[PDB]
Amino acid sequence: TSAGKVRKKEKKEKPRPPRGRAYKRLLYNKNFVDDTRLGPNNLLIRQK
Amino acid sequence: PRISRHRNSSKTYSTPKKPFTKPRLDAELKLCGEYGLKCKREIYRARYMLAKIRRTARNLLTLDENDIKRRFEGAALLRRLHMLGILDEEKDQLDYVLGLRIEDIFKRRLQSVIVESKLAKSVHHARNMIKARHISVGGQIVNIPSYMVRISNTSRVAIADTSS
Amino acid sequence: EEWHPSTKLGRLVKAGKIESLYDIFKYSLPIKETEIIDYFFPKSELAEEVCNIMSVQKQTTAGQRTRFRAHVIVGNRDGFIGYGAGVSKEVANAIKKAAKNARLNIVPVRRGFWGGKLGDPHTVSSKLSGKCGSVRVRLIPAPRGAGIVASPTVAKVLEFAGVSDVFTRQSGHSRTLMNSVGAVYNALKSSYSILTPDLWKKEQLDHVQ
Amino acid sequence: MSKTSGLYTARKLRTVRRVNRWADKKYRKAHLGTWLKANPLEGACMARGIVTQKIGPNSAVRKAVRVQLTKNSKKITAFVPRDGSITYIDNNDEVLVAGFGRAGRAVGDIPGCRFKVIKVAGIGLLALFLRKREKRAR
Amino acid sequence: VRINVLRDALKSICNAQRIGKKQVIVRPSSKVIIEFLQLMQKNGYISDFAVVDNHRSNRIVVNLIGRLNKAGVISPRFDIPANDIEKWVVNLLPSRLFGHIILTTSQGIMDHIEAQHRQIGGKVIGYFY
RNA sequence: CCCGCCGGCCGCCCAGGGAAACCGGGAGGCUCCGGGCUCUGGGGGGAGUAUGGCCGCAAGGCUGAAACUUGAAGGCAUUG
RNA sequence: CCCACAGCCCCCGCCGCGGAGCCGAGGGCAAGCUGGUGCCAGCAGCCGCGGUAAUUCCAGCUCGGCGAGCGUCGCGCGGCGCUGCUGCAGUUGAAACGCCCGUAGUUGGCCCCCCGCCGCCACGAGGAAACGGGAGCGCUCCAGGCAGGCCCGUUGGAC
Ligand SMILES: [Mg+2]
Ligand SMILES: [Mg+2]
Ligand SMILES: [Mg+2]
Ligand SMILES: [Mg+2]
């Protein structure tokens, strides 16, 4: 009946990424030098 | 009207007709990594220049060898390419021009000549040093990373005599 | 266990009597054994790709019967290309059949020069056209450094065939992959059957083979 | 063969193309003049008008509004897309109305709607739905 | 009615070659046909031919030896600038290496290479390769 | 009687062509895409409708829109 | 230092603020984890999602594109060989007037060895620059401008 009825976690304070060109450098070591695939749920289970 | 209306202006780069193409993305990223490129407009500028060279070479090649226009334009183009160092000295045929690639353009950048002289630890180190103004191209200090160095000045690119 | 040839050509190939695949193509012998192509390519120089995978259904008394059809190409990036198809109830066996069929049929691709003759050939010899279904393809020689001007699918074939510079034009319902690939394959196959004046030289036949 | 090909036949070719190029629906709609007069937007990017009433295989009712263009005085309906934006529009509020992606034609499952609402009281709808700005002045 | 004798002659020749014959007949015996055949013969496509008189549009006989793939005419003779030939070359012939385009000039019937050498142009008659 | 020539009406068909059914006395000689002349068509509806003009005793014929609407309508063929 | 006066660029000494957003993650189209709601609210250029795992809505995490720019709306070009001169189609998909005669119009077999005329091709004159192409010159590069060095083609600004 009430619109917006469907429409709390504190944000995780973590350091910002290295902007500028370093971001590209961050990707370069992300997949090639560092072991990859990406997107599995079980992969995040490893991350947690 | 104001005199400012007669100042000419034009763009200098192009964008790929198909943007999302995996091989192109990977190749562009790889070239950025080997040359420490900021954004992707520089590759577009390089491709623009290469396209101009190739089109001129084609038009001259369609014509006869003994065409006066052919002689004139080819001589000018060869002289410019050689003075820039992009094309090897031993080559003086217009046919070789069609085989040039943007990598030869990159190799004559200020960062490139700086690094291959072993004057810098890396492309990123070279860029940061260039910004701080520690380099004296010829006898004049230059703070433009994309400055292109001719053959006659490659032996003359040194450290700034004023830098600490 | 081992490869026991089932054909005279297979036996001769098992023996070191035949030394090159071009020695086979010159007399238009049909190929039926997949072992023959690996013997000339011991190190597995040939590449492989899976262009498409589609599902085909047949109506029956009880529900539907489904199946899978696959298209595969292979090449060593140096004047050799092949196209093949396979259909089966399961995807993997269909892919294996398609790869086997593509390996079975293979043709050489002739290459030439655009204007200046310097170094190795870099593009097609001349204009080539092919026809399959509603699709038509035109291959035009190009200058050095021009890249491959074509759609991603056709460019894959031209890459696996060992070309670097070429212009292409397409017509018809190009969204049908099988017929586009077939048309380009036919155009490439026609390459070595096109007379040119340098081949006007009159050569006497050879009794051997 | 079918077409003329003589060396002194350019006039006929020009006339034939002139006559036959009117058969295309797009060319007609663009160069004929009927649509421009019949379009309540008269070739403009978007219009400024005044709202006067709120109304709304998929079975979801879409929220829209009836509007009258200031410069034209003809009536149309424009549809407010972004969630929760019905409450942000009040009766008799100045609005700016543009078009959907398909010029002229209807878009999506919405019957009889061919426009969009992008501003109310001078504030972008997107800037308000994300809470960047606020409509406290109205 | 009959108009372009050259087109009919060329079509007959190509049809005969397709089934690998050796001798053909062509009713018209125009001068333009004769020069076209002369150029073909000199370049090495058709070898020999003879003209058979009869006082009523003489007939001509030609011999075949393969080689020839295609040959046609351009029905309305365009005007070709001396400097505007590469476009036609690319549009019509398979490759820039081989092939001959026939142009009629004030200097006589010649091939596009010859005219390119003399830096002059004219009207186009046909082509073959 | 059988061996031919011209013209006409037909059947089957190698190549070739085509999305295919099929054509093959061309629907062949065409993306390798130019013999000459004329006419018609540009997604489906609204609509061969309205409004004008001409012809006709009349019934009606020739010419011939737009607004608006819509995401498919169609061709040949395959299995049930 | 420059400037009609002031700024501003640049040079010189002292102290020294390091800051990225806009779109999207089913296909076209590069880019995936829980909580809500339940054909409601909403997304969606097209196909489509949502009637209890919602890979498409609403939030968090993660990820991708471009980048001091990003996205939306309308118009033109291209996409388009869907206006087709190059270069469409006309048995069955939309499309050969029911047939004949016939004027304007368009198109017209072969042949003459050198004369005149029209078209045609090449060259030339003559006539504005800017823009465009283009020779040469390191405004720190560049967008630009026609400069500039010492012992300069009469320094150059050609075409
Ligand atoms: Mg045609
Ligand atoms: Mg059409
Ligand atoms: Mg219609
Ligand atoms: Mg029909």
Side-chain angles (χ1 to χ4, degrees), chain B residues 68-69 72-73:
Chain B
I68 178 180
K69 189 224 196 196
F72 199 78
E73 244 301 3

mmCIF file of all heavy atoms in Angstrom, chain B residues 68-69 72-73, chain G residues 125 129-136 156-159:
data_model
loop_
_atom_site.group_PDB
_atom_site.id
_atom_site.type_symbol
_atom_site.label_atom_id
_atom_site.label_comp_id
_atom_site.label_asym_id
_atom_site.label_seq_id
_atom_site.Cartn_x
_atom_site.Cartn_y
_atom_site.Cartn_z
ATOM 1 N N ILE B 68 57.433 14.421 -60.177
ATOM 2 C CA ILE B 68 58.100 15.493 -59.443
ATOM 3 C C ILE B 68 57.491 15.637 -58.053
ATOM 4 O O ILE B 68 58.205 15.783 -57.052
ATOM 5 C CB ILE B 68 58.027 16.812 -60.235
ATOM 6 C CG1 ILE B 68 58.670 17.952 -59.443
ATOM 7 C CG2 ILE B 68 56.586 17.178 -60.544
ATOM 8 C CD1 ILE B 68 58.636 19.280 -60.163
ATOM 9 N N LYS B 69 56.161 15.598 -57.973
ATOM 10 C CA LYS B 69 55.504 15.646 -56.673
ATOM 11 C C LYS B 69 55.924 14.469 -55.809
ATOM 12 O O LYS B 69 56.161 14.620 -54.606
ATOM 13 C CB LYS B 69 53.990 15.651 -56.855
ATOM 14 C CG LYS B 69 53.217 15.920 -55.578
ATOM 15 C CD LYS B 69 52.039 14.974 -55.445
ATOM 16 C CE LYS B 69 51.041 15.466 -54.413
ATOM 17 N NZ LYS B 69 50.106 14.389 -53.996
ATOM 18 N N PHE B 72 59.472 15.143 -54.479
ATOM 19 C CA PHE B 72 59.485 16.199 -53.472
ATOM 20 C C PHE B 72 58.916 15.706 -52.147
ATOM 21 O O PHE B 72 59.562 15.809 -51.092
ATOM 22 C CB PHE B 72 58.678 17.385 -53.999
ATOM 23 C CG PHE B 72 58.958 18.683 -53.299
ATOM 24 C CD1 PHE B 72 60.099 19.408 -53.586
ATOM 25 C CD2 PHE B 72 58.071 19.182 -52.366
ATOM 26 C CE1 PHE B 72 60.352 20.604 -52.947
ATOM 27 C CE2 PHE B 72 58.319 20.375 -51.723
ATOM 28 C CZ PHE B 72 59.459 21.088 -52.014
ATOM 29 N N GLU B 73 57.705 15.150 -52.188
ATOM 30 C CA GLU B 73 57.020 14.775 -50.959
ATOM 31 C C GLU B 73 57.718 13.614 -50.269
ATOM 32 O O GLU B 73 57.856 13.608 -49.040
ATOM 33 C CB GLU B 73 55.565 14.429 -51.265
ATOM 34 C CG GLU B 73 54.547 15.352 -50.612
ATOM 35 C CD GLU B 73 54.656 15.383 -49.098
ATOM 36 O OE1 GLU B 73 55.564 14.729 -48.546
ATOM 37 O OE2 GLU B 73 53.828 16.066 -48.460
ATOM 38 P P A G 125 50.274 29.315 -67.054
ATOM 39 O OP1 A G 125 51.487 29.817 -66.361
ATOM 40 O OP2 A G 125 49.326 28.441 -66.321
ATOM 41 O "O5'" A G 125 49.461 30.568 -67.607
ATOM 42 C "C5'" A G 125 50.040 31.444 -68.562
ATOM 43 C "C4'" A G 125 48.993 32.283 -69.250
ATOM 44 O "O4'" A G 125 48.000 31.426 -69.852
ATOM 45 C "C3'" A G 125 48.197 33.213 -68.351
ATOM 46 O "O3'" A G 125 48.875 34.436 -68.131
ATOM 47 C "C2'" A G 125 46.876 33.388 -69.099
ATOM 48 O "O2'" A G 125 46.951 34.464 -70.025
ATOM 49 C "C1'" A G 125 46.750 32.070 -69.868
ATOM 50 N N9 A G 125 45.732 31.148 -69.330
ATOM 51 C C8 A G 125 45.943 29.943 -68.712
ATOM 52 N N7 A G 125 44.849 29.313 -68.376
ATOM 53 C C5 A G 125 43.846 30.156 -68.820
ATOM 54 C C6 A G 125 42.450 30.055 -68.765
ATOM 55 N N6 A G 125 41.818 29.023 -68.217
ATOM 56 N N1 A G 125 41.722 31.058 -69.294
ATOM 57 C C2 A G 125 42.372 32.089 -69.841
ATOM 58 N N3 A G 125 43.679 32.299 -69.955
ATOM 59 C C4 A G 125 44.370 31.283 -69.418
ATOM 60 P P A G 129 44.737 34.358 -54.241
ATOM 61 O OP1 A G 129 46.156 34.252 -54.659
ATOM 62 O OP2 A G 129 43.907 33.131 -54.136
ATOM 63 O "O5'" A G 129 44.717 35.106 -52.835
ATOM 64 C "C5'" A G 129 45.055 34.417 -51.643
ATOM 65 C "C4'" A G 129 44.737 35.235 -50.419
ATOM 66 O "O4'" A G 129 43.485 35.941 -50.616
ATOM 67 C "C3'" A G 129 44.523 34.458 -49.129
ATOM 68 O "O3'" A G 129 45.731 34.095 -48.485
ATOM 69 C "C2'" A G 129 43.661 35.406 -48.313
ATOM 70 O "O2'" A G 129 44.447 36.430 -47.724
ATOM 71 C "C1'" A G 129 42.779 36.020 -49.397
ATOM 72 N N9 A G 129 41.510 35.289 -49.549
ATOM 73 C C8 A G 129 41.067 34.608 -50.651
ATOM 74 N N7 A G 129 39.896 34.049 -50.493
ATOM 75 C C5 A G 129 39.547 34.387 -49.197
ATOM 76 C C6 A G 129 38.416 34.099 -48.423
ATOM 77 N N6 A G 129 37.390 33.380 -48.866
ATOM 78 N N1 A G 129 38.374 34.584 -47.166
ATOM 79 C C2 A G 129 39.407 35.310 -46.730
ATOM 80 N N3 A G 129 40.526 35.651 -47.360
ATOM 81 C C4 A G 129 40.530 35.152 -48.604
ATOM 82 P P A G 130 45.879 32.650 -47.800
ATOM 83 O OP1 A G 130 47.199 32.595 -47.126
ATOM 84 O OP2 A G 130 45.531 31.625 -48.815
ATOM 85 O "O5'" A G 130 44.753 32.635 -46.671
ATOM 86 C "C5'" A G 130 44.930 33.342 -45.454
ATOM 87 C "C4'" A G 130 43.689 33.293 -44.599
ATOM 88 O "O4'" A G 130 42.555 33.775 -45.369
ATOM 89 C "C3'" A G 130 43.269 31.908 -44.128
ATOM 90 O "O3'" A G 130 43.948 31.494 -42.957
ATOM 91 C "C2'" A G 130 41.766 32.054 -43.947
ATOM 92 O "O2'" A G 130 41.455 32.693 -42.719
ATOM 93 C "C1'" A G 130 41.416 32.992 -45.096
ATOM 94 N N9 A G 130 41.061 32.264 -46.327
ATOM 95 C C8 A G 130 41.756 32.273 -47.507
ATOM 96 N N7 A G 130 41.216 31.545 -48.448
ATOM 97 C C5 A G 130 40.087 31.020 -47.844
ATOM 98 C C6 A G 130 39.085 30.162 -48.320
ATOM 99 N N6 A G 130 39.070 29.665 -49.557
ATOM 100 N N1 A G 130 38.092 29.825 -47.470
ATOM 101 C C2 A G 130 38.118 30.325 -46.231
ATOM 102 N N3 A G 130 39.003 31.141 -45.667
ATOM 103 C C4 A G 130 39.975 31.455 -46.539
ATOM 104 P P C G 131 44.542 30.004 -42.858
ATOM 105 O OP1 C G 131 45.039 29.801 -41.475
ATOM 106 O OP2 C G 131 45.448 29.787 -44.011
ATOM 107 O "O5'" C G 131 43.270 29.071 -43.063
ATOM 108 C "C5'" C G 131 42.187 29.107 -42.148
ATOM 109 C "C4'" C G 131 41.051 28.230 -42.605
ATOM 110 O "O4'" C G 131 40.482 28.759 -43.828
ATOM 111 C "C3'" C G 131 41.419 26.802 -42.961
ATOM 112 O "O3'" C G 131 41.544 25.966 -41.825
ATOM 113 C "C2'" C G 131 40.293 26.395 -43.895
ATOM 114 O "O2'" C G 131 39.126 26.044 -43.169
ATOM 115 C "C1'" C G 131 40.036 27.698 -44.646
ATOM 116 N N1 C G 131 40.759 27.756 -45.932
ATOM 117 C C2 C G 131 40.262 27.018 -47.002
ATOM 118 O O2 C G 131 39.241 26.339 -46.827
ATOM 119 N N3 C G 131 40.905 27.058 -48.190
ATOM 120 C C4 C G 131 42.000 27.806 -48.320
ATOM 121 N N4 C G 131 42.607 27.822 -49.505
ATOM 122 C C5 C G 131 42.525 28.573 -47.242
ATOM 123 C C6 C G 131 41.877 28.519 -46.075
ATOM 124 P P G G 132 42.756 24.919 -41.726
ATOM 125 O OP1 G G 132 42.467 24.011 -40.590
ATOM 126 O OP2 G G 132 44.033 25.672 -41.774
ATOM 127 O "O5'" G G 132 42.641 24.072 -43.066
ATOM 128 C "C5'" G G 132 41.570 23.161 -43.255
ATOM 129 C "C4'" G G 132 41.751 22.353 -44.515
ATOM 130 O "O4'" G G 132 41.475 23.176 -45.678
ATOM 131 C "C3'" G G 132 43.152 21.822 -44.761
ATOM 132 O "O3'" G G 132 43.436 20.650 -44.019
ATOM 133 C "C2'" G G 132 43.165 21.616 -46.270
ATOM 134 O "O2'" G G 132 42.512 20.407 -46.629
ATOM 135 C "C1'" G G 132 42.319 22.797 -46.745
ATOM 136 N N9 G G 132 43.148 23.955 -47.124
ATOM 137 C C8 G G 132 43.265 25.134 -46.439
ATOM 138 N N7 G G 132 44.074 25.982 -47.009
ATOM 139 C C5 G G 132 44.515 25.321 -48.143
ATOM 140 C C6 G G 132 45.411 25.742 -49.155
ATOM 141 O O6 G G 132 46.006 26.820 -49.250
ATOM 142 N N1 G G 132 45.586 24.762 -50.122
ATOM 143 C C2 G G 132 44.975 23.533 -50.119
ATOM 144 N N2 G G 132 45.265 22.709 -51.134
ATOM 145 N N3 G G 132 44.138 23.129 -49.179
ATOM 146 C C4 G G 132 43.954 24.067 -48.230
ATOM 147 P P G G 133 44.930 20.355 -43.507
ATOM 148 O OP1 G G 133 44.882 19.134 -42.665
ATOM 149 O OP2 G G 133 45.505 21.606 -42.949
ATOM 150 O "O5'" G G 133 45.723 19.992 -44.838
ATOM 151 C "C5'" G G 133 45.330 18.881 -45.626
ATOM 152 C "C4'" G G 133 46.062 18.837 -46.942
ATOM 153 O "O4'" G G 133 45.749 20.013 -47.727
ATOM 154 C "C3'" G G 133 47.580 18.845 -46.870
ATOM 155 O "O3'" G G 133 48.126 17.576 -46.556
ATOM 156 C "C2'" G G 133 47.969 19.343 -48.255
ATOM 157 O "O2'" G G 133 47.923 18.291 -49.208
ATOM 158 C "C1'" G G 133 46.843 20.333 -48.559
ATOM 159 N N9 G G 133 47.238 21.736 -48.330
ATOM 160 C C8 G G 133 46.819 22.586 -47.340
ATOM 161 N N7 G G 133 47.348 23.776 -47.425
ATOM 162 C C5 G G 133 48.163 23.708 -48.545
ATOM 163 C C6 G G 133 48.996 24.684 -49.145
ATOM 164 O O6 G G 133 49.189 25.852 -48.796
ATOM 165 N N1 G G 133 49.644 24.184 -50.269
ATOM 166 C C2 G G 133 49.513 22.908 -50.751
ATOM 167 N N2 G G 133 50.213 22.602 -51.846
ATOM 168 N N3 G G 133 48.737 21.992 -50.205
ATOM 169 C C4 G G 133 48.101 22.457 -49.113
ATOM 170 P P G G 134 49.385 17.458 -45.565
ATOM 171 O OP1 G G 134 49.831 16.044 -45.571
ATOM 172 O OP2 G G 134 49.027 18.111 -44.282
ATOM 173 O "O5'" G G 134 50.519 18.326 -46.270
ATOM 174 C "C5'" G G 134 51.159 17.865 -47.449
ATOM 175 C "C4'" G G 134 51.935 18.964 -48.129
ATOM 176 O "O4'" G G 134 51.070 20.109 -48.348
ATOM 177 C "C3'" G G 134 53.111 19.535 -47.354
ATOM 178 O "O3'" G G 134 54.279 18.737 -47.448
ATOM 179 C "C2'" G G 134 53.267 20.917 -47.970
ATOM 180 O "O2'" G G 134 53.935 20.843 -49.220
ATOM 181 C "C1'" G G 134 51.810 21.303 -48.215
ATOM 182 N N9 G G 134 51.243 22.088 -47.104
ATOM 183 C C8 G G 134 50.352 21.670 -46.147
ATOM 184 N N7 G G 134 50.035 22.603 -45.293
ATOM 185 C C5 G G 134 50.762 23.706 -45.712
ATOM 186 C C6 G G 134 50.834 25.016 -45.182
ATOM 187 O O6 G G 134 50.249 25.487 -44.202
ATOM 188 N N1 G G 134 51.694 25.817 -45.921
ATOM 189 C C2 G G 134 52.395 25.415 -47.028
ATOM 190 N N2 G G 134 53.176 26.333 -47.607
ATOM 191 N N3 G G 134 52.340 24.197 -47.529
ATOM 192 C C4 G G 134 51.508 23.404 -46.829
ATOM 193 P P A G 135 55.417 18.820 -46.315
ATOM 194 O OP1 A G 135 56.148 17.531 -46.316
ATOM 195 O OP2 A G 135 54.801 19.303 -45.055
ATOM 196 O "O5'" A G 135 56.413 19.944 -46.843
ATOM 197 C "C5'" A G 135 57.293 19.686 -47.927
ATOM 198 C "C4'" A G 135 58.308 20.788 -48.096
ATOM 199 O "O4'" A G 135 57.642 22.000 -48.525
ATOM 200 C "C3'" A G 135 59.065 21.201 -46.842
ATOM 201 O "O3'" A G 135 60.161 20.350 -46.554
ATOM 202 C "C2'" A G 135 59.479 22.635 -47.151
ATOM 203 O "O2'" A G 135 60.663 22.668 -47.937
ATOM 204 C "C1'" A G 135 58.303 23.129 -47.998
ATOM 205 N N9 A G 135 57.333 23.930 -47.228
ATOM 206 C C8 A G 135 56.055 23.585 -46.871
ATOM 207 N N7 A G 135 55.422 24.515 -46.203
ATOM 208 C C5 A G 135 56.345 25.547 -46.123
ATOM 209 C C6 A G 135 56.288 26.823 -45.538
ATOM 210 N N6 A G 135 55.222 27.291 -44.896
ATOM 211 N N1 A G 135 57.378 27.610 -45.632
ATOM 212 C C2 A G 135 58.452 27.137 -46.273
ATOM 213 N N3 A G 135 58.627 25.958 -46.864
ATOM 214 C C4 A G 135 57.524 25.202 -46.753
ATOM 215 P P G G 136 60.601 20.083 -45.031
ATOM 216 O OP1 G G 136 61.778 19.182 -45.042
ATOM 217 O OP2 G G 136 59.388 19.702 -44.267
ATOM 218 O "O5'" G G 136 61.083 21.506 -44.507
ATOM 219 C "C5'" G G 136 62.369 22.012 -44.834
ATOM 220 C "C4'" G G 136 62.586 23.382 -44.244
ATOM 221 O "O4'" G G 136 61.560 24.284 -44.729
ATOM 222 C "C3'" G G 136 62.477 23.479 -42.730
ATOM 223 O "O3'" G G 136 63.655 23.079 -42.054
ATOM 224 C "C2'" G G 136 62.114 24.943 -42.515
ATOM 225 O "O2'" G G 136 63.263 25.777 -42.578
ATOM 226 C "C1'" G G 136 61.228 25.222 -43.728
ATOM 227 N N9 G G 136 59.793 25.098 -43.406
ATOM 228 C C8 G G 136 58.966 24.014 -43.565
ATOM 229 N N7 G G 136 57.740 24.243 -43.177
ATOM 230 C C5 G G 136 57.763 25.557 -42.733
ATOM 231 C C6 G G 136 56.737 26.374 -42.194
ATOM 232 O O6 G G 136 55.551 26.096 -41.989
ATOM 233 N N1 G G 136 57.205 27.642 -41.878
ATOM 234 C C2 G G 136 58.495 28.075 -42.054
ATOM 235 N N2 G G 136 58.778 29.334 -41.698
ATOM 236 N N3 G G 136 59.458 27.327 -42.557
ATOM 237 C C4 G G 136 59.023 26.092 -42.869
ATOM 238 P P G G 156 65.481 35.773 -49.094
ATOM 239 O OP1 G G 156 65.663 35.273 -50.481
ATOM 240 O OP2 G G 156 65.062 37.179 -48.867
ATOM 241 O "O5'" G G 156 64.430 34.830 -48.358
ATOM 242 C "C5'" G G 156 64.634 33.427 -48.293
ATOM 243 C "C4'" G G 156 63.605 32.756 -47.421
ATOM 244 O "O4'" G G 156 63.715 33.248 -46.062
ATOM 245 C "C3'" G G 156 62.154 33.004 -47.793
ATOM 246 O "O3'" G G 156 61.709 32.173 -48.851
ATOM 247 C "C2'" G G 156 61.425 32.767 -46.478
ATOM 248 O "O2'" G G 156 61.217 31.382 -46.249
ATOM 249 C "C1'" G G 156 62.439 33.298 -45.462
ATOM 250 N N9 G G 156 62.172 34.688 -45.055
ATOM 251 C C8 G G 156 62.788 35.814 -45.539
ATOM 252 N N7 G G 156 62.357 36.916 -44.991
ATOM 253 C C5 G G 156 61.399 36.488 -44.084
ATOM 254 C C6 G G 156 60.587 37.234 -43.196
ATOM 255 O O6 G G 156 60.552 38.458 -43.025
ATOM 256 N N1 G G 156 59.753 36.409 -42.457
ATOM 257 C C2 G G 156 59.699 35.045 -42.558
ATOM 258 N N2 G G 156 58.824 34.443 -41.746
ATOM 259 N N3 G G 156 60.452 34.333 -43.379
ATOM 260 C C4 G G 156 61.272 35.116 -44.109
ATOM 261 P P G G 157 60.581 32.690 -49.871
ATOM 262 O OP1 G G 157 60.536 31.745 -51.015
ATOM 263 O OP2 G G 157 60.818 34.131 -50.136
ATOM 264 O "O5'" G G 157 59.225 32.544 -49.048
ATOM 265 C "C5'" G G 157 58.868 31.306 -48.452
ATOM 266 C "C4'" G G 157 57.804 31.479 -47.398
ATOM 267 O "O4'" G G 157 58.309 32.333 -46.342
ATOM 268 C "C3'" G G 157 56.522 32.158 -47.858
ATOM 269 O "O3'" G G 157 55.612 31.248 -48.455
ATOM 270 C "C2'" G G 157 55.991 32.792 -46.581
ATOM 271 O "O2'" G G 157 55.271 31.849 -45.800
ATOM 272 C "C1'" G G 157 57.282 33.164 -45.853
ATOM 273 N N9 G G 157 57.679 34.568 -46.074
ATOM 274 C C8 G G 157 58.593 35.034 -46.986
ATOM 275 N N7 G G 157 58.751 36.327 -46.948
ATOM 276 C C5 G G 157 57.891 36.739 -45.942
ATOM 277 C C6 G G 157 57.626 38.036 -45.444
ATOM 278 O O6 G G 157 58.113 39.113 -45.802
ATOM 279 N N1 G G 157 56.687 38.007 -44.424
ATOM 280 C C2 G G 157 56.077 36.876 -43.946
ATOM 281 N N2 G G 157 55.195 37.053 -42.953
ATOM 282 N N3 G G 157 56.314 35.660 -44.399
ATOM 283 C C4 G G 157 57.226 35.668 -45.391
ATOM 284 P P A G 158 54.718 31.685 -49.716
ATOM 285 O OP1 A G 158 54.826 33.155 -49.895
ATOM 286 O OP2 A G 158 53.384 31.056 -49.560
ATOM 287 O "O5'" A G 158 55.433 30.994 -50.957
ATOM 288 C "C5'" A G 158 56.651 31.503 -51.476
ATOM 289 C "C4'" A G 158 57.371 30.463 -52.294
ATOM 290 O "O4'" A G 158 57.825 29.394 -51.425
ATOM 291 C "C3'" A G 158 56.533 29.763 -53.353
ATOM 292 O "O3'" A G 158 56.459 30.499 -54.561
ATOM 293 C "C2'" A G 158 57.229 28.418 -53.506
ATOM 294 O "O2'" A G 158 58.360 28.523 -54.357
ATOM 295 C "C1'" A G 158 57.702 28.152 -52.077
ATOM 296 N N9 A G 158 56.764 27.320 -51.301
ATOM 297 C C8 A G 158 56.030 27.713 -50.213
ATOM 298 N N7 A G 158 55.288 26.766 -49.697
ATOM 299 C C5 A G 158 55.560 25.671 -50.500
ATOM 300 C C6 A G 158 55.088 24.349 -50.477
ATOM 301 N N6 A G 158 54.207 23.896 -49.584
ATOM 302 N N1 A G 158 55.554 23.501 -51.416
ATOM 303 C C2 A G 158 56.436 23.961 -52.310
ATOM 304 N N3 A G 158 56.956 25.177 -52.435
ATOM 305 C C4 A G 158 56.471 25.994 -51.488
ATOM 306 P P C G 159 55.049 30.711 -55.297
ATOM 307 O OP1 C G 159 55.325 31.306 -56.629
ATOM 308 O OP2 C G 159 54.134 31.403 -54.354
ATOM 309 O "O5'" C G 159 54.504 29.232 -55.525
ATOM 310 C "C5'" C G 159 55.196 28.324 -56.370
ATOM 311 C "C4'" C G 159 54.675 26.918 -56.215
ATOM 312 O "O4'" C G 159 54.887 26.457 -54.855
ATOM 313 C "C3'" C G 159 53.184 26.729 -56.432
ATOM 314 O "O3'" C G 159 52.819 26.682 -57.799
ATOM 315 C "C2'" C G 159 52.906 25.439 -55.675
ATOM 316 O "O2'" C G 159 53.301 24.305 -56.434
ATOM 317 C "C1'" C G 159 53.842 25.584 -54.477
ATOM 318 N N1 C G 159 53.152 26.145 -53.295
ATOM 319 C C2 C G 159 52.395 25.298 -52.482
ATOM 320 O O2 C G 159 52.315 24.098 -52.766
ATOM 321 N N3 C G 159 51.762 25.803 -51.401
ATOM 322 C C4 C G 159 51.867 27.099 -51.121
ATOM 323 N N4 C G 159 51.231 27.566 -50.047
ATOM 324 C C5 C G 159 52.631 27.981 -51.930
ATOM 325 C C6 C G 159 53.251 27.471 -52.996
#
